[PDB]
RNA sequence: AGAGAAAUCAAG
RNA sequence: UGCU
RNA sequence: GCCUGUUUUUGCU
RNA sequence: GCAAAAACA
């Protein structure tokens, strides 16, 4: 490590890039997640009391603890109710513009939120198939479930979706009918359990940690509810100085620099992490903070109930245990459930619900990053704390401007205690304070005189993407360009990355050495003329943003005769399977439908080489969307608002298109005759 | 903002404080409807005069004091609950603007004021139509039609209809049994109402100490770590084959090869040399994929799972217990320093042949000159040749993956010097790989040329003696299984050159910027703690050994390395602060070294970095 | 065997 | 069956 | 196998 | 809007 600590030319902050083993393999998880899941379940109960008493903590519903019960020498699970109330009141009294924006979002933006925003998620636990499915599939099957159990249509808004979710909870028996045909039954208790179930699963390819961690995913019955509170929290956090989570990239760096003002006699800079986050935060604290925010805003009761649903559902969460703890007799390996034979998690047997285990304390999952940020920020607002604080989720940086060292130490301890009041524990081994400010870290961004560039955080993106030569070259060069713009890579590193990417990109498409492609080009006398074909690079450091074909045409490296062939919109290589519609600006017929191909012959598609009914349903939706887009050019620019159902709307639109086609009347009649 | 386009800005800002819109159902739509009513009131009194005074007096959105003052002057009184929107001087009677969904079957609402009812399409009821003039009717109809177009554009028809009707749902509600389900795991109801008075209590905390001395990393005790990597590293060599294709080189090697075992390891039986010889013979013919033989089972561990499970079942005795997995601790091997020293040895070739980018501007020339300087100062080095070997081997092993083969594939590792001669580093044998995931292992038989043999460094290698053209070489021939993801990652190992290039470029460009002139030939002196003492050392050799250490770190990347490097950044920052006469203060139970020491188990380069940290000073004055 | 690290691959 |  | 949030790059509808 | 990739928490 002595080679990474220069003393003369550059400082170790600039060499922090060297403390990265990237371009080496990323660690993976192999076996059962049961031990990790059970450890995350048991940790909140171990931290509620100063002396770990798990058995006495499992009977606690709301984790609220007296100020004398708050552990100061270790992690503390739970919150102080009076502290939460007073700190939320203080945070509301200050930052009034943020609360005005919250009221604006509630009145205006919230009613316009659509439940189709839930489709943006990744793999989602499905309460119907008991598996992990893509968010569109789970959303659509949940919508069908609500429609066929409530015997009504669900409105496009997210409020209607949440109301339908709440209404289904009132039924005694619910059923799901879906094509394979098959029918599944849900009681109120069964569907409640599926609502409050989080599907646990390993986190693979994660760098920077010795021990593998477990990630979880909720069902669509609660993702919608979490969406409202997350959007409201984002709206509040965008308008408060002390937040750092909703901003990112260069804007986050600018916000950090706006607070790096060290003018007093003693100017510290505390940068640290919060230990055991996502499991020392009781959801009831977030409930109380949101309730205070809505009360002081004059909001009605229904919005309060809506905001309080998700945190109660997470108070009743059911974490999915893995496929069993590993047991061995000799050199055997057997996987057994929690309660079969004694282990270190015997105290949690009473919480077992089938293959899932309950946990009333903590969050167990980062589903409330913005709300946890708000909970952290409300505790900052108090008279003793006069410094500048930035908190994203559990990574924070604090700047002190104090007259004396003792005052700074008192402020730092007050910061620690006020964080502990709401269930947030500073990691003692990860929090470091520098008494003269100027050196710090936040979100792995180290600054000494300015935020130094961090090479090797851009190396994993330097591999060709693998779509097609044009897209791969374009996006690789633009990633390098963004790295150069942000200051991560300078002239030399940028050019070297360009050369390495170009060499790997030419290798990946059989453009180096003697390959089948090169042999075919050689025996048929086909000069490359393109980077992916083995020609010399046309792109330079200053021309990263320029397209290859246009630059080659401008420089004369690609003659017009070959351009007439490469950019043919009728080439068989990229020909589409169906005709497409085209605009015609200032023409008698403004829309023409004809067969089309992607202009570039090198934008081909690589064959991938290997809930089915729902996929056919997606295909039907795609067909309907395609015909709607063809017949309604204006929904491509603005939202769809035509009245009636799809069939009648497109029927009248097709008619009106016909009477403006400028043909003979009888020809229009014969065209209309065959319309279904 | 939230103002609809058809709503005038003055009307919108006047409506802000008229009603508490947050508590009303569809507060935004309610405000829009009230703005519609006020605009209709404005349009009715469209600059009409009577006896030198406005014909209509508008009561809507006016302070109650003025309303009572002017109503008293007009000998009219109205109750607080309902007040007419406007008053007409002609045909003296109070009027109120009403919006209704249906114009038919409508009756007057109150006997104290008249109703000017309108529908959402801009039409007016008969008495309202006859009271007002045609111009007022047209203005009101046009404004209401613009409002209707705004409504249908924003898909707010249902909300507007419900608002106009007068009654609407709370837009969200929680039933009874759902509330009971929700309140199961909490001590508060849906909208919590704790009885405790808000307060921030004072809690006795602790005192923040000071990191007067830098932490000391724990050095583990145990046997020295063996070389646990895919390939040999600095002990890699090659045979200079005559120019030709891969098939010619393999034929030339095999036809003149004399293999004799000189050191056999129990991990890799010496009998699997026949696998390599058969693979070489098959590749020399033009058929890289060959059929299985008897010793392929031993070489690639074919079916080992069944015999292992049968032995486990036969030897199964006792009582079931928990797993309690353990990781053996190992000390820093002596060969890490030797690897670092030998990796810096100069070569006769450049070993980094990257095609230059185009040059159009002067900035392009500067960048390419910097890249060329870096390449020439790190190219002629053993580490560059080892990186090239790793690249070739990883890519040629990864390209024959992705299929379900029951046969044996041979993957030669051959490079070519800038004279046409082939350089045979070794050969990778890929066995039966029924691979389905990205983490499942694929059996391999890594055979490659070794420069020097060491029992403690390579305990699992069976070293052979290779006799080709009156020359003596060594052969490693280790049995390993290696995953798809790691092979893909090592297929792009050439990216490791960026970080030492980053250091070199930052030094050169900082020197250029301070004196406001580029040099491109600066080789300054870097002060470092080499043997516990600060001594000067040139930039070029510093970049060379930075590249060597970065490469050695990349091929030995594991969870231990990841955690160690993640947790040494705090200590690196603390040391950089301490070298600038800055004090470092810590919380009560702050031991930043524990989260590093937990990651120091058996990784030789983690131990090397830990020893490098320990050697250099920990107290700064 | 081996890869590997808090338990998986090395077949069904 | 050929990336310095 | 492949969560949540923020930011970034590219391509296609 | 969708899809792919990357970084951070």
Swiss-Prot record, chain A:
Keywords: Nucleotide-binding, Nucleotidyltransferase, RNA-directed RNA polymerase, Transferase, Viral RNA replication. Residues 257-432 form the RdRp catalytic domain. The keyword Nucleotidyltransferase applies. This is RNA-directed RNA polymerase catalytic subunit. PROSITE patterns: RDRP_SSRNA_NEG_SEG (PS50525). InterPro entries: DNA/RNA_pol_sf, RNA-dir_pol_NSvirus, RNA_pol_PB1_influenza. It is an enzyme of class 2 (transferase). RNA polymerase is composed of three subunits: PA, PB1 and PB2. Pfam families: Flu_PB1.
Curated annotation (Swiss-Prot), chain B:
Pfam families: Flu_PA (PF00603). One of its GO terms (cellular component) is host cell nucleus. Keywords: Host nucleus, Virion. GO terms for molecular function: RNA binding. It is found in: Virion; Host nucleus. InterPro entries: PA/PA-X, PA/PA-X_sf. One of its GO terms (biological process) is viral RNA genome replication. Belongs to the influenza viruses PA family. subunit of the RNA-dependent RNA polymerase which is responsible for replication and transcription of virus RNA segments. The transcription of viral mRNAs occurs by a unique mechanism called cap-snatching. 5' methylated caps of cellular mRNAs are cleaved after 10-13 nucleotides by PA. In turn, these short capped RNAs are used as primers by PB1 for transcription of viral mRNAs. During virus replication, PB1 initiates RNA synthesis and copy vRNA into complementary RNA (cRNA) which in turn serves as a template for the production of more vRNAs. RNA polymerase is composed of three subunits: PA, PB1 and PB2. This is Polymerase acidic protein. It comes from Thogoto virus (isolate SiAr 126).
């Amino acid at each position: 490590m002595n080679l990474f600590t220069p003393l003369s030319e550059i400082n170790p902050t600039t060499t922090q890039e060297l403390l990265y083993a990237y371009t080496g393999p990323a660690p993976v998880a192999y076996g059962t997640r049961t031990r990790a899941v059970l450890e995350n379940i048991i940790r909140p109960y171990q931290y509620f009391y100063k002396e770990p008493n798990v058995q006495r903590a499992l009977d606690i519903k709301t984790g609220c603890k007296e100020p004398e019960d708050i552990n100061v020498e270790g992690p503390s699970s739970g919150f102080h109710t009076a502290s939460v109330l007073k700190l939320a009141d203080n945070f509301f009294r200050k930052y009034r513009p943020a609360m005005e924006k919250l009221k604006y979002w509630i009145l205006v933006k919230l009613p316009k939120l659509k439940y189709a925003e839930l489709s943006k998620g990744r793999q989602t636990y499905s309460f119907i198939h008991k598996r992990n499915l893509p968010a569109p599939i789970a959303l659509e099957e949940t919508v069908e479930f609500l429609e066929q159990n409530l015997r009504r249509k669900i409105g496009p808004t997210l409020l209607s979706y949440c109301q339908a979710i709440a209404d289904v909870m009132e039924l005694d028996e619910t059923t799901y009918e879906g094509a394979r045909t098959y029918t599944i039954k849900f009681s109120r208790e069964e569907l409640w359990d599926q609502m409050r179930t989080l599907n646990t699963m390993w986190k693979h390819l994660e760098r920077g940690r010795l021990n593998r961690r477990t990630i979880a995913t909720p069902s669509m019955l609660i993702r919608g509810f979490v969406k409202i509170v997350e959007d409201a929290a984002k709206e509040i956090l965008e308008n408060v100085p002390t937040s750092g989570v909703p901003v990112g990239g260069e804007e986050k760096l600018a916000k950090l620099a706006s607070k790096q003002t060290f003018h007093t006699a003693v100017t510290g800079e505390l940068s640290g992490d919060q230990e055991k986050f996502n499991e020392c935060l009781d959801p009831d604290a977030m409930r109380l903070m949101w309730t205070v925010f809505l009360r002081k805003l004059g909001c009605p009761d229904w919005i309060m109930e809506l905001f309080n649903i998700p945190f109660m559902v997470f108070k009743s969460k059911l974490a999915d245990m893995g496929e069993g703890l590993v047991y061995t007799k000799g050199k055997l390996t057997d996987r057994k459930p929690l309660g079969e034979m004694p282990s270190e998690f015997d105290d949690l047997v009473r919480n077992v619900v089938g293959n899932s285990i309950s946990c009333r304390l903590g969050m167990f999952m980062g589903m409330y990053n913005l709300t946890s940020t708000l909970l952290a920020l409300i505790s900052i607002e108090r008279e003793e704390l006069t410094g500048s604080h930035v908190e994203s989720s559990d990574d924070f940086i604090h700047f002190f401007n104090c007259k004396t060292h003792e005052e700074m130490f008192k402020q730092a301890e007050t910061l620690r205690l006020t964080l502990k009041l709401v269930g947030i524990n500073m990691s003692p081994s990860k929090c470091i304070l520098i008494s003269p400010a100027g050196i710090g870290e936040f979100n792995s961004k180290f600054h000494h005189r300015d935020f130094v560039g961090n090479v090797a955080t851009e190396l994993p993106a330097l591999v060709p993407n693998g779509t097609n030569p044009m897209t791969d070259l374009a996006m690789g060069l633009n990633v390098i360009k963004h790295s150069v713009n942000t200051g991560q890579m300078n002239l030399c590193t940028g050019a070297l990355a360009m050369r390495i990417f170009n060499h790997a990109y030419k290798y990946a498409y059989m453009a180096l050495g003697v390959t089948r492609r090169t042999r075919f080009m050689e025996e048929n006398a086909i000069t490359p003329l393109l980077t992916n074909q083995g020609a010399s690079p046309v792109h330079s450091f200053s021309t990263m943003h320029l397209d290859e074909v246009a630059l080659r045409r401008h420089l004369g490296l690609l003659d017009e005769e070959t351009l007439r062939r490469i950019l043919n919109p009728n080439n068989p290589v990229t020909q589409k399977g169906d005709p497409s519609m085209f605009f015609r600006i200032e023409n008698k017929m403004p829309q023409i439908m004809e067969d089309y191909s992607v202009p570039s012959c090198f934008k081909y598609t690589l064959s991938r080489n290997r809930h089915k009914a729902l996929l056919n349903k997606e295909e039907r939706y795609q067909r309907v969307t395609s015909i709607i887009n063809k017949l309604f050019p204006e929904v491509l620019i603005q939202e769809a608002s035509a009245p009636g159902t799809v069939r009648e709307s497109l029927k009248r639109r097709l008619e009106l298109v016909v009477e403006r086609s400028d043909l003979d009347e009888e020809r229009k009649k014969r065209i209309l005759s065959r319309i279904f | 903002t939230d103002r609809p386009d058809h709503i005038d800005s003055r009307v919108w800002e006047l409506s802000e404080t008229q009603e508490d819109w947050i508590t009303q159902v569809h507060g935004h739509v309610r405000r829009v409807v009230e703005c519609w009513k006020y605009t209709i009131c404005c349009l009715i009194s469209n600059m009409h005069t009577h006896r030198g005074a406005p014909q209509y007096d508008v009561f809507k959105w006016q302070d109650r004091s003025t309303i009572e003052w002017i109503c008293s002057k007009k000998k009219v009184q109205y109750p607080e609950r309902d007040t007419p929107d406007l008053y007409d001087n002609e045909r003296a009677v109070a009027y109120k603007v009403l919006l209704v969904s249906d114009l038919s079957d409508h009756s007057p609402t109150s006997g104290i004021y008249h109703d000017l009812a309108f529908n959402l399409e801009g039409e007016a009821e008969e008495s309202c139509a006859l009271v007002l003039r045609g111009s007022q009717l047209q203005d009101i109809k046009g404004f209401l039609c613009r409002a209707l177009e705004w409504v249908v554009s924003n898909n707010l028809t249902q909300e507007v209809v419900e608002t106009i009707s007068g009654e609407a749902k709370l837009q969200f509600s929680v039933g009874t049994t759902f509330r009971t389900l929700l309140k199961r795991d909490t001590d508060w109801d849906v909208i919590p109402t704790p009885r405790v008075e808000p307060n921030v209590p004072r809690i006795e905390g602790r005192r923040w100490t000071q990191m007067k001395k830098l932490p000391l990393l724990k050095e583990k005790e145990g046997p020295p770590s063996p070389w646990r990597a895919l390939l040999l590293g600095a002990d890699s060599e090659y045979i200079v084959c005559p120019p030709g294709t891969d098939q010619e080189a393999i034929s030339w090697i095999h036809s003149q090869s004399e293999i004799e075992c000189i050191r056999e390891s129990k991990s890799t039986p010496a009998s699997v040399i026949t696998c390599l010889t058969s693979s070489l013979q098959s590749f020399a013919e033009g058929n890289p994929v060959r059929s299985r033989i008897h010793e392929d089972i031993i070489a690639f561990g074919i079916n080992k799972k069944q015999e292992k499970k049968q032995s486990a079942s036969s030897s199964a005795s006792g009582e079931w217990k928990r797993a309690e997995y353990q990781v053996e601790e190992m000390s820093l091997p002596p060969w890490v320093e030797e690897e670092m020293v030998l990796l810096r040895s100069d070569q006769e070739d450049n070993w980094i042949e990257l095609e230059k980018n185009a040059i159009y501007t002067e900035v392009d020339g500067v960048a390419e000159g910097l890249v060329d300087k870096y390449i020439e100062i790190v190219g002629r080095t053993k580490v560059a040749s080892v990186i090239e070997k790793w690249q070739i081997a990883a890519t040629r092993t990864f390209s024959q993956l992705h299929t379900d083969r029951s046969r044996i594939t041979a993957c030669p590792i051959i490079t070519r010097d800038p004279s046409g001669n082939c350089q045979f580093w070794g050969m990778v044998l890929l066995g039966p790989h029924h691979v389905k995931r990205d983490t499942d292992n694929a059996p391999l038989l890594i055979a490659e040329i070794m420069g020097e043999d060491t029992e403690e460094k390579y305990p699992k290698h069976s070293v052979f003696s290779l006799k080709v053209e009156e020359k003596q070489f060594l052969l490693s021939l280790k049995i390993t299984s290696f995953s798809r993801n790691k092979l893909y990652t090592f297929s792009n190992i050439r990216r490791v050159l960026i970080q030492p290039a980053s250091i070199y470029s930052q030094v050169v460009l900082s020197r250029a910027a301070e004196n406001n002139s580029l040099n491109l030939e600066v080789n300054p002196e870097i002060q470092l703690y080499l043997e516990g003492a600060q001594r000067g050392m040139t930039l070029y050799q510093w970049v060379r050994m930075i590249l060597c250490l970065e490469f050695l770190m990349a091929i030995y990347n594991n969870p231990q390395m990841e955690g160690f490097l993640a947790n040494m950044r705090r200590l690196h920052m603390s040391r950089h602060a301490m070298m600038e006469r800055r004090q470092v203060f810590l919380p009560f139970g702050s031991r930043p070294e524990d989260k590093v020491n937990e990651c120091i188990i058996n990784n030789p380069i983690v131990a090397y970095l830990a020893k490098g940290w320990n050697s250099m000073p920990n107290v700064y004055y």
